[PDB]
Amino acid sequence: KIEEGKLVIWINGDKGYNGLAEVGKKFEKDTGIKVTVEHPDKLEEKFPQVAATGDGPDIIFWAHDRFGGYAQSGLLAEITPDKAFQDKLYPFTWDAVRYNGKLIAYPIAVEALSLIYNKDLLPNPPKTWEEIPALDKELKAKGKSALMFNLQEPYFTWPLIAADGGYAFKYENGKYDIKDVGVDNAGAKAGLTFLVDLIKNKHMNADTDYSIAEAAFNKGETAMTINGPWAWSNIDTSKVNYGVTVLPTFKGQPSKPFVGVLSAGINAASPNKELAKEFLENYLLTDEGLEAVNKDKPLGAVALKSYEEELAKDPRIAATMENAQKGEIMPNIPQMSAFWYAVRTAVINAASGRQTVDEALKDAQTRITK
Numbered sequence: 623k624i625e626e627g628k629l630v631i632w633i634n635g636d637k638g639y640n641g642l643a644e645v646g647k648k649f650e651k652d653t654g655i656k657v658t659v660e661h662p663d664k665l666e667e668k669f670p671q672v673a674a675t676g677d678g679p680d681i682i683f684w685a686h687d688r689f690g691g692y693a694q695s696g697l698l699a700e701i702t703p704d705k706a707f708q709d710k711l712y713p714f715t716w717d718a719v720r721y722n723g724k725l726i727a728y729p730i731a732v733e734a735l736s737l738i739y740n741k742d743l744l745p746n747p748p749k750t751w752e753e754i755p756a757l758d759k760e761l762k763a764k765g766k767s768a769l770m771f772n773l774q775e776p777y778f779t780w781p782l783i784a785a786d787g788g789y790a791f792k793y794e795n796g797k798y799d800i801k802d803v804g805v806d807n808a809g810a811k812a813g814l815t816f817l818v819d820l821i822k823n824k825h826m827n828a829d830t831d832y833s834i835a836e837a838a839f840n841k842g843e844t845a846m847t848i849n850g851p852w853a854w855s856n857i858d859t860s861k862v863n864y865g866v867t868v869l870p871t872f873k874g875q876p877s878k879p880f881v882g883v884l885s886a887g888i889n890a891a892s893p894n895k896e897l898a899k900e901f902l903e904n905y906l907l908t909d910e911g912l913e914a915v916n917k918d919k920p921l922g923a924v925a926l927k928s929y930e931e932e933l934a935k936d937p938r939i940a941a942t943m944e945n946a947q948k949g950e951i952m953p954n955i956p957q958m959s960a961f962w963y964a965v966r967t968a969v970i971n972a973a974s975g976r977q978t979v980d981e982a983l984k985d986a987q988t989r990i991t992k
């Protein structure tokens with residue numbers, strides 16, 4: 623029971639929803655159908671709930687990791703573009719949105735986390751995680767901190783856990799093995815232990831969330847933060863003189879971020895599939911439609927080769943790609959939501975001291991593997 627003749631879009635509150643709304647605004651100025659863009663809370667958990675009932679949005683935007691679960695549950699329409707359109711996008715990006723060899727979403731942008739630093743407070747960013755505790759001791763003396771980032775969402779902590787060997791699911795033939803999980807190996811335990819230690823040594827606080835880390839850096843009280851492209855618009859308005867670069871190394875290895883592909887899916891239950899398709903392929907996925915969204919909140923490296931060509935010149939995009947290169951594309955299997963929930967509890971229990979690192983990762987491994 624969705625109302626034909628309109629488009630309702632769901633996008634996360636951290637993305638350029640006002641720019642998206644302008645893209646729909648000239649969709650309608652030229653097609654008569656109104657597009658309404660919403661950013662509900664926890665949309666990613668709500669979608670499967672109402673979509674199930676034959677409700678929800680026409681189009682849902684999220685990183686590709688949640689899409690194999692939606693596809694398995696029968697909530698998404700298979701998209702079928704065409705080889706000329708497919709050719710306009712980087713091939714690895716359509717691979718991120720293939721579920722059982724079928725395409726189930728349009729790729730939009732490639733996101734990777736980077737190290738953001740205040741050049742006025744730290745002209746040369748550190749190359750290693752290991753020098754962060756000494757750096758904090760000097761800034762603290764001057765009333766500032768070396769680094770603050772969201773500790774509440776496992777997405778932010780995974781690059782460090784993965785650096786020395788942690789992994790989610792082993793990719794074995796061209797299949798992910800759901801029984802071979804790397805959350806409790808020596809690599810994962812070494813990274814999580816370094817994090818807990820920064821905490822126990824008062825270099826970071828266990829409660830820092832997205833808001834606190836973002837205000838701390840935007841106000842100049844912390845020299846560095848770890849975030850994605852979407853955060854740049856707020857740093858620009860704060861006028862901090864910042865740099866975006868490669869994440870620090872841990873035990874000599876590159877921090878390895880999970881790479882996300884912002885994707886747009888069509889609810890299986892919509893009577894507007896062709897309008898949806900119109901909208902995504904001919905309006906949004908254009909240099910003009912992507913530019914409009916990007917002005918609002920930067921998208922990262924886009925999937926459309928044409929526009930990415932324009933963006934690649936920006937050192938912030940170059941740093942984005944370099945960290946994506948060092949990282950791994952997330953799986954899109956249904957089990958990714960179980961993985962994230964288990965790791966989220968493990969990290970909060972370890973950081974808060976409610977469990978040791980070993981008991982926290984062992985419980986997570988257990989939980990993910992049944």
Ligand SMILES: OC[C@H]1O[C@H](O[C@H]2[C@H](O)[C@@H](O)[C@@H](O[C@H]3[C@H](O)[C@@H](O)[C@@H](O)O[C@@H]3CO)O[C@@H]2CO)[C@H](O)[C@@H](O)[C@@H]1O
Pocket residue numbers: 634636666667685686687688733775776777778850882959962963966
């Ligand atoms: O931790 C519980 C949380 O896990 C799952 O969320 C993950 C997202 O699915 C995954 O894409 C990633 O999300 C980041 C987005 O990709 C990024 O664009 C930006 O919005 O930040 C997000 C992190 O806040 O990582 C999270 C895990 O942290 C699951 O889908 C959620 O329902 C669940 O609440």
